[PDB]
Amino acid sequence: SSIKVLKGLDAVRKRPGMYIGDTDDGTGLHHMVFEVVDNAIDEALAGHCKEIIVTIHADNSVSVQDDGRGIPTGIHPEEGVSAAEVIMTVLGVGVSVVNALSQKLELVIQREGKIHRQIYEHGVPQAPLAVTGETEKTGTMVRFWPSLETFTNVTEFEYEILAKRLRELSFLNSGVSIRLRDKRDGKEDHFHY
Ligand SMILES: Cc1[nH]c(C(=O)Nc2nc3c(OCc4ccccc4)cc(C(=O)O)cc3s2)c(Cl)c1Cl
């Protein structure tokens, strides 16, 4: 299972434009955010998520936080690791593509009364998903640092590109609240049809 996962991550890194879009003109870079957001939108479509928060951090990482069910955390029997880790690492291109093309990715899940956290580097988990505390909230937070071994030329997120797509998704999923926050300059928008 471990050997197949590393090979799948490698397949994405070998042909990244094919999975995420052009890696030099900023298309693929912004599609990384859109893939994560799309998973949060799917959680809204299923009737669980009401609010999505997208943050451009000061270090040009992006986080997406939802208030959905939380990715399942229990051990998946075939692989012997958390279901969350399987979803994050086994190949709508799937969040595993974003993980494969991220120098670092942080996952925080609130589910069944617990907070769970895991860190990845180039898709490789640094430790098993672990409990960090108790919570009465539910949801998923993914923060990723795009790999500059993949993304060239356009490496800094464009607020306006994200804002336009999130406004579209708020209109097309009326009822969902989407917040966009830029920690680089303090800009914020709230989209809620
Ligand atoms: C920001 C974000 N949110 C999510 C997310 O909420 N995904 C979820 N998938 C799931 C989920 O999906 C499991 C799954 C679906 C398709 C393929 C493999 C596993 C199941 C259950 C459940 O049964 O309670 C809950 C959730 S929440 C993802 Cl993935 C990302 Cl990235």
Residue numbers in the entry: 8 to 98, 117 to 218
Paper text:
Bacterial DNA gyrase and DNA topoisomerase IV (topo IV), both type II topoisomerases, responsible for the ATP-driven introduction of negative supercoils into DNA and ATP-driven supercoil relaxation and decatenation, respectively, are validated antibacterial targets. Gyrase is a heterotetramer of GyrA and GyrB subunits (A2B2), while topo IV is a heterotetramer of ParC and ParE subunits (C2E2). We have developed compounds with a promising activity against Acinetobacter baumannii and Pseudomonas aeruginosa, which are both on the WHO priority list of antibiotic-resistant bacteria. Cocrystal structures of 1 in complex with Escherichia coli GyrB24 and (S)-27 in complex with A. baumannii GyrB23 and P. aeruginosa GyrB24 revealed their binding to the ATP-binding pocket of the GyrB subunit.
Having worked for several years on the development of benzothiazole scaffold-based GyrB inhibitors,9−19 the introduction of the carboxylic acid group to position 6 and attachment of a benzyloxy substituent to position 4 of the benzothiazole scaffold led us to the discovery of 4-(benzyloxy)-2-(3,4-dichloro-5-methyl-1H-pyrrole-2-carboxamido)benzo[d]thiazole-6-carboxylic acid (1), a potent gyrase inhibitor with excellent in vitro and in vivo activities, demonstrated in murine dermal and thigh infection models, against Gram-positive S. aureus as well as against methicillin-resistant- (MRSA) and vancomycin-resistant S. aureus (VISA). A crystal structure of compound 1 in complex with E. coli GyrB24 (24 kDa amino-terminal subdomain of GyrB) obtained at a 1.16 Å resolution provides evidence of the inhibitor binding to the ATP-binding site of GyrB. IC50 values for the inhibition of E. coli DNA gyrase-catalyzed supercoiling and topo IV-catalyzed relaxation of 1 measured in gel-based assays are consistent with those determined by high-throughput microtiter-plate-based assays. The compound does not stabilize the gyrase cleavage complex and does not show significant inhibition of ATP-independent relaxation (IC50 > 10 μM). The pyrrole NH group is involved in a hydrogen bond with the Asp73 side chain, while the carboxamide oxygen interacts with the conserved water molecule and Thr165 side-chain hydroxyl group. The 3,4-dichloro-5-methylpyrrole moiety forms several hydrophobic interactions with the residues in the lipophilic pocket of the enzyme, namely, Val43, Ala47, Val71, Ile78, Val120, and Val167. The benzothiazole scaffold forms a cation−π stacking interaction with the Arg76 side chain. In addition, a salt bridge is formed between the Arg136 side chain and the aromatic carboxylate group of inhibitors 1 and 7. In 1, the nitrogen of the benzothiazole ring and the oxygen atom at position 4 form hydrogen bonds with a water molecule, while the phenyl ring has hydrophobic contacts with the side chain of Ile94.
